[PDB]
């Protein structure tokens, strides 16, 4: 501290905790923001897990069919 960095002319205003509302517009803007956030990251995150779900189901069903007796066999 005091030597961490060299900045200049950057003024920084702030308020006391007890002087400001604890949850200013928490759900007022929180929801919009959370939603804003989800739409900037959903296309990068979700489709891999979607195809994991498809591969998992596929594997399960395929495995079952694999186990299901071959009707043609044994006849």
């Amino acid at each position: 501290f005091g030597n961490l960095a060299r900045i200049r002319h950057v003024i920084s205003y702030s308020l006391s905790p007890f002087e400001q509302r604890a949850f200013p517009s928490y759900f007022s803007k929180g929801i919009p923001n959370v939603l804003r956030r989800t739409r900037e990251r959903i296309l990068r995150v979700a489709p891999p897990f979607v195809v994991v779900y498809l591969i998992y189901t596929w594997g399960n069903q395929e495995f079952e069919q694999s186990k299901r007796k071959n009707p043609a066999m044994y006849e």
């Binding site: 501290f1 900045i7 002319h9 003024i11 205003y13 702030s14 308020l15 905790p17």
Partner: protein, 403 residues
């Protein structure tokens, strides 16, 4: 047996007070209850720019011939402006008492604001401000006022923002002049070799024409500029005001605090109409920044918790020895007289100050200090290499002790 300051307000409202002394030299001033607190952000530099224009000539005494007159008797002409008061004072001889009063009359009324001068004084004011930034402690105290009184007329500076300075016109000035220069808000104060009856007759002769929610905010403002060699930090809490007597006790505490670590410690009790800033403005090297603070906060909490009788006696003696502020000199007394009548409405004598000092003991000092310092949200203003200056949680936690 303090010499009383005889006072003679006029029907217009012009209180005329004076105190006589052996000095054959007398200081006469006009105090006006008009500062940056009465400005409404559209005329934020009107008092300062009028204070520049007030010596550049009147209607009766056009231009420098006016100041030729105050050269002719060898008198000295001064003026100053604060956030609440404006003063125009002259130090002269006793025998030149009438003309000086007449000169002061012109300066308060019948003043002439020349458009030519307005541009010249704008360049003066603009340039000074453009270089005023040089004075750090002024920058730090302006930052402290701004962050402590945000959203109020007490945040704005006396000089105003360059913007207004450029954008100001005779009519605006005329307004401030015609609005905040009322006779009931004016004191003609005289100190030294003056007679009160002669001064009252001179005020009746001239000057008889004069026409007839503050909030503190705890906030961390930090102007970081690492190229400066030294850092200036001011920490304050809300003061009581002019009329609250425990100011005296706070003055003792300020005295007890004195200045012990990093250089440039100091203490202030700035008072405005039922408000104020009570605190300390140290200035130091990168490392000392925090400790000093730490140091400083410890002293405040010691005054809230562990005040002893010996340091209280020392602070009382320092404050009494500080009554020398009153002294006997024409100027200081006159000044003191000037405020007394504007703020308290009366001149408090030194015997009453001594009584209010001697009634202060250690128990009421730590009670009043706990009332004003303990667990309070401070206003912090820093300028310079202030990275190691702690943020608001650490200072706020240093405003109390867990023991």
């Amino acid at each position: 047996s303090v010499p009383e300051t005889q006072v003679s307000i006029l029907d217009n409202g012009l209180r005329v007070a004076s105190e006589q002394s052996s000095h054959a030299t007398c200081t006469v001033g006009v105090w006006i209850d008009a500062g940056s607190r009465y400005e409404t952000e559209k005329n934020n530099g009107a008092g300062y720019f009028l204070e520049h224009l007030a010596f550049k000539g009147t209607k009766n005494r056009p231009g420098n011939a006016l100041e030729k007159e105050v050269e002719s008797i060898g008198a000295h002409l001064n003026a100053y402006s604060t956030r609440e008061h404006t003063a125009y004072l002259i130090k002269a001889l006793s025998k030149d008492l009438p003309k000086v009063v007449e000169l002061l009359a012109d300066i308060v009324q019948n003043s002439s604001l020349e458009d030519s001068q307005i541009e010249k004084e704008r360049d003066v004011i603009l340039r000074e401000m453009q270089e005023n930034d040089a004075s750090m402690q002024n920058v730090v105290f302006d930052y402290l006022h701004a962050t402590a009184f945000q959203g109020t007329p007490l945040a704005q500076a006396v000089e105003g923002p360059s913007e207004n300075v450029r954008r100001l016109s005779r009519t605006d000035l005329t307004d401030y002049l015609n609005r905040h220069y009322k006779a009931p808000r004016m004191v003609l104060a005289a100190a030294g070799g003056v007679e009160h009856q002669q001064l009252l007759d001179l005020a009746q002769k001239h000057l008889s024409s004069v026409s007839r929610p503050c909030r503190f905010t705890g906030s961390e403002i930090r102007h970081r500029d690492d190229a400066l060699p030294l850092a200036h930090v001011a920490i304050a809490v809300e003061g009581p005001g002019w009329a609250n007597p425990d100011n005296v006790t706070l003055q003792v505490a300020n005295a007890i605090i004195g200045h012990y670590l990093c250089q440039s410690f100091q203490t202030f009790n700035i008072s405005y109409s039922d408000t104020g800033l009570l605190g300390a403005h140290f200035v130091c090297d990168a490392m000392s920044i925090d400790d000093m603070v730490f140091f400083l906060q410890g002293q405040w909490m010691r005054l809230c918790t562990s005040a002893t009788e010996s340091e209280v006696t020392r602070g009382k003696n320092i404050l009494r020895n500080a009554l020398v502020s009153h002294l006997d000199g024409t100027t200081p007394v006159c000044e003191d007289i000037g405020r007394s009548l504007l703020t308290y409405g009366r001149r408090i004598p030194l015997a009453e100050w001594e009584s209010r000092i001697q009634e202060v003991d250690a128990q009421m000092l730590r009670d009043i200090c706990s009332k004003y310092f303990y667990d309070q949200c401070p206003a912090v203003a820093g300028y310079g290499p202030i990275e190691q200056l702690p943020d608001y949680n650490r200072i706020r936690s240093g405003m109390f002790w867990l023991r």
